[PDB]
Write a protein that binds this DNA or RNA. Structure first.
Ligand SMILES: Cc1ccc2c(=S)n([C@H]3C[C@H](O)[C@@H](COP(=O)(O)OP(=O)(O)OP(=O)(O)O)O3)ccc2c1
Ligand SMILES: Cc1ccc2c(=S)n([C@H]3C[C@H](O)[C@@H](COP(=O)(O)OP(=O)(O)OP(=O)(O)O)O3)ccc2c1
Ligand SMILES: [Mg+2]
Ligand SMILES: [Mg+2]
Ligand SMILES: [Mg+2]
Ligand SMILES: [Mg+2]
Ligand SMILES: [Mg+2]
Length: 540
DNA sequence: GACCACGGCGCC
DNA sequence: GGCGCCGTGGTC
């Protein structure tokens, strides 16, 4: 089809490119091509050829930009058909799916990926041209956001490696203590990491009562909720829970992270995936830095490993009760809006209620526990479920969920309106028009339909929170450039920045105001902001 | 070696 | 409700 022409391509060409591996910060650039005007240009030597580009324009453009930045080239990402397709329908998450759906095949040759990007973009641009609000999201949010994300990915975050190695040894010894005891109590050794072998010991050998079954294969479950409930039944249970906590943290964070330090940067480099969720949230992978531990004491020691560069500080910014505020705006509920206009704190109140203590008797772990309840109920957990969580009697767990929606009456009407409109149009949308298609709203099996309903009415809330954060990042990022600060991480409703010591305070201020004023709702948005040498200390 | 489903669980 | 990653038990 396309005519072969010598590198370099004309300006505005679409790029195709092949990596030795998926992570742009670790990949070798194996091949690079560009397509325009019925021509394909194949770069004789990919790395040198990178220099001739003014923009990365095509499928997965941000990945190439990150690699370009890694090599010291300011090559910003531009148009990316993935972003167009993701906006049309957030189930469009892979180039293979998007290719197949919108006019090509995702292959392993850079020239074909180049030609593909050009074709897909033409086709998707057509599909998105009529959709004014999706077009605004692309232009004002997703396209610029992709540039911000490239810089974040290429920058990475410093990690205290020596600290984590030493931590590992401490935790290994405690783990051996726990497994030794568990084996003594079981009467014999087994693979304590195997939930199948654990199930036999707990339920066949020790004769403990099985409480629940696993979803797919119907095994007797050994999950934390099951064990939690058997705490009093046998002393092996508590020891297992402790074993589970430590091994989770050692296997997921303490051991892998030090091995992932980039040799050029001396830092850790996540990937921020922009077309990965049903709701418009970002995701993070390879490594995932959006689930760094924070709840338990050992989790906090791990979070402490994320530190500022020498002479710099971390600045951590976290939206306050973000999705409950979004809900207030979307529902128009006067009581809920009133709560936020009065500067109240719903998690502290629930926490006060939960633990039965003064408003001023709530600490960061009571409050945190109060989050599960508020978001749990709002997004439709059943009274029975809440009984088990507290754990308080039914009807007491049922009375909380009734007084919860009686205090906030328009929330229900918004939920019912959203669902009705979802059945009719086949999708729900955020405040800015981001869509999620939810076809099962009309399923004839109740539990499928009702799962679909929960996904459907959650998406405008979670997704709008996500729109706001992305737009905040887009506005904030060029202000930071000017001040010499760096944006390092996004964690859904939180940003972590790195700033020179002497500028940290002005940077915290600036970021807080940009985030709070990103898009005035019927309620104020508030941001908690902390500064410190490590991530744990920067909160807040 | 790579990949898979699963159970399980870390965060928002 | 939304994610991504772990080890096990597998297959290939
Ligand atoms: C166990 C469980 C189950 C569901 C959820 C759900 S759905 N979220 C959703 C709702 C949150 O708004 C948003 C940001 O989370 P954050 O922890 O910052 O909460 P916040 O309300 O902003 O409080 P803050 O004032 O910052 O302390 O993510 C969070 C945790 C969670 C945990
Ligand atoms: C753009 C720009 C630049 C600088 C500033 C500075 S310096 N301030 C300082 C001056 C006053 O001492 C104080 C009053 O504000 P408020 O009562 O809100 O306190 P807060 O810290 O904002 O708490 P909050 O999170 O809002 O609850 O904040 C405020 C806004 C501002 C905006
Ligand atoms: Mg928050
Ligand atoms: Mg947060
Ligand atoms: Mg203020
Ligand atoms: Mg404040
Ligand atoms: Mg799974």
């Amino acid at each position: 089809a396309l005519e072969e022409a010598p590198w370099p391509p004309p300006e505005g060409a679409f790029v195709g490119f092949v990596l030795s591996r998926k992570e742009p910060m670790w990949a070798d650039l194996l091949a690079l091509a560009a397509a325009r005007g019925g021509r394909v240009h194949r770069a004789p030597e990919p790395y040198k050829a990178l220099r001739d580009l003014k923009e990365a324009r095509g499928l997965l453009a941000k990945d190439l930009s990150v690699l370009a930045l890694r090599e010291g080239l300011g090559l910003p990402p531009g148009d990316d058909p993935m972003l167009l397709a993701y906006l049309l329908d957030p189930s469009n998450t892979t180039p293979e799916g998007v290719a197949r759906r919108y006019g090509g095949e995702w292959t392993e040759e850079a020239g074909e990926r180049a030609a593909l990007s050009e074709r897909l973009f033409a086709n998707l641009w057509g599909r998105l041209e009529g959709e004014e609000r999706l077009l605004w999201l692309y232009r004002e949010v997703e396209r610029p956001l992709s540039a911000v994300l490239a810089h974040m990915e290429a920058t990475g975050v410093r990690l205290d490696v020596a600290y984590l190695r030493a931590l590992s040894l401490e935790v290994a010894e405690e783990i051996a203590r726990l497994e030794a005891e568990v084996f003594r109590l079981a009467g014999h050794p087994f693979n304590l990491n195997s939930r199948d072998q654990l199930e036999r010991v707990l339920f066949d050998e020790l004769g403990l009562p099985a409480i629940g079954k696993t979803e797919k294969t119907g095994k007797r479950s050994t999950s934390a909720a099951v064990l939690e409930a058997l705490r009093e039944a046998h002393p092996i249970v508590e020891k297992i829970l402790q074993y589970r906590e430590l091994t989770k943290l050692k296997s997921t964070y303490i051991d892998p992270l030090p091995d992932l330090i980039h040799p050029r940067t001396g830092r850790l480099h996540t990937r921020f995936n922009q077309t990965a969720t049903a709701t418009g949230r970002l995701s993070s992978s390879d490594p995932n830095l959006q689930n760094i531990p924070v709840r338990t004491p050992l989790g906090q020691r791990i979070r402490r490993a994320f530190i500022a560069e020498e002479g710099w500080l971390l600045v951590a910014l976290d939206y306050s009760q973000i999705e409950l505020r979004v809900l207030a705006h979307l529902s128009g509920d006067e009581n809920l809006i009133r709560v936020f206009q009065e500067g109240r704190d719903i998690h502290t109140e629930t926490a006060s209620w939960m633990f039965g203590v003064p408003r001023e008797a709530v600490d960061p772990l009571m409050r945190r526990a109060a989050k599960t309840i508020n978001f749990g109920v709002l997004y439709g957990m059943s009274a029975h479920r809440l009984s088990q969580e507290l754990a308080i009697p039914y009807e007491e767990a049922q009375a909380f969920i009734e007084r919860y929606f009686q205090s906030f009456p328009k929330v229900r009407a918004w939920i019912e309106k959203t669902l009705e409109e979802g059945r009719r149009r086949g999708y729900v949308e955020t405040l800015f028009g981001r869509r999620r298609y939810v076809p099962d709203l009309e399923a004839r099996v109740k539990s499928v339909r009702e799962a679909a309903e929960r996904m459907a009415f959650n998406m405008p809330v979670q997704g709008t929170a996500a729109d706001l954060m992305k737009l905040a990042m887009v506005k904030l990022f060029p202000r930071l450039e000017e001040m010499g600060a760096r944006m390092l991480l996004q964690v859904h409703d939180e940003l972590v920045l790195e700033a020179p010591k002497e500028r940290a305070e002005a940077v915290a201020r600036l970021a807080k105001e940009v985030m709070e004023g990103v898009y005035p709702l019927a309620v104020p948005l508030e941001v908690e902001v902390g500064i410190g040498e490590d991530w744990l200390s920067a909160k807040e």
